Amino acid sequence: MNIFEMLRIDEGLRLKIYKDTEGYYTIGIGHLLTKSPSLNAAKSELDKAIGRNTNGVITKDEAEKLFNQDVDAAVRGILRNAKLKPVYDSLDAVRRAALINMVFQMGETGVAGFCNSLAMLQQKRWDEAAVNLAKSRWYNQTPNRAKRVITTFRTGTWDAYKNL
Ligand SMILES: *SCC1=CC(C)(C)N(O)C1(C)C
């Protein structure tokens, strides 16, 4: 298991524009196109992202390309963020992947707001961190996914993602 395989399981793969759990136009492996309710706006973002006129449809290679960019961007985002970098650096590689997964899903800003949870993680109080992480809109709206990420932070293993 690794961050790519982990997010591939959590985000799925779809080659046509679809709406994500929040109702937002998305494509590929969880590539958010826009929060605008206009399909035309989403299509424009997609053609820009891919570099051709796609009419709302891309290939698996194209999906994987955006995905690699989105993973890289999440991580570099973490490393440029004064609230996230110290926790990230303090973690082992498995729990690092959990933190990348959160940022991919909710953005740097949403995760930075988890300051109480981040402090518990910095302190390696893994069970306490897990309890605090669940007290969140994130857990309530995507509980199965949140449970997997929280298990990863609690155990520092991939147990929630193997057999899946
Ligand atoms: S969200 C940034 C942050 C603030 C403080 C409460 C000092 N923390 O421990 C972290 C780094 C979580």
Q: What is the CATH number of domain 1-164?
A: 1.10.530.40
Length of the chain: 164
User: 93-112 vs 3-11: helix axis angle to the nearest 10?
Assistant: 50
Tell me, using a 6 A CB cutoff, whether residue 122 lines ligand 1.
yes
71: tokens are: 């993973």
DSSP code per residue over 54-111:
-TTB--HHHHHHHHHHHHHHHHHHHHT-TTTHHHHHHS-HHHHHHHHHHHHHHHHHHH
At 32 the three-state DSSP class reads strand
Q: CB–CB of 72/64 below 8 Å?
A: no
CA distance 74 to 84: 11
Q: From 89, 115, 117, give the residue whose CB has the most ligand 1 atoms within 8 Å, as the site to mutate.
A: 115
CB 130 within 8 A of CB 99: no
Integer Cα distance of 132 and 13 in angstroms:
30
In the residue annotation, 11 being an active-site residue is answered as: yes
Domain boundaries, the chain: 1-164
- Look at phi and psi of residue 12 and say left if phi exceeds 0, alpha if psi is from -120 to 50, else beta: left
| Ligand 1 center to 35 CA (angstroms) | 28
8-state DSSP, 35:
S
Q: State the CB neighbour count (10 A cutoff) for residue 130.
A: 20
Q: Solved how? A: X-ray
- Cα 8 to ligand 1 centroid, rounded to whole Å: 29
C-alpha dihedral sign at 75, 101, 62, 35: negative
Using CA atoms, how far apart are residues 113 and 118, in angstroms rounded to an integer? 9
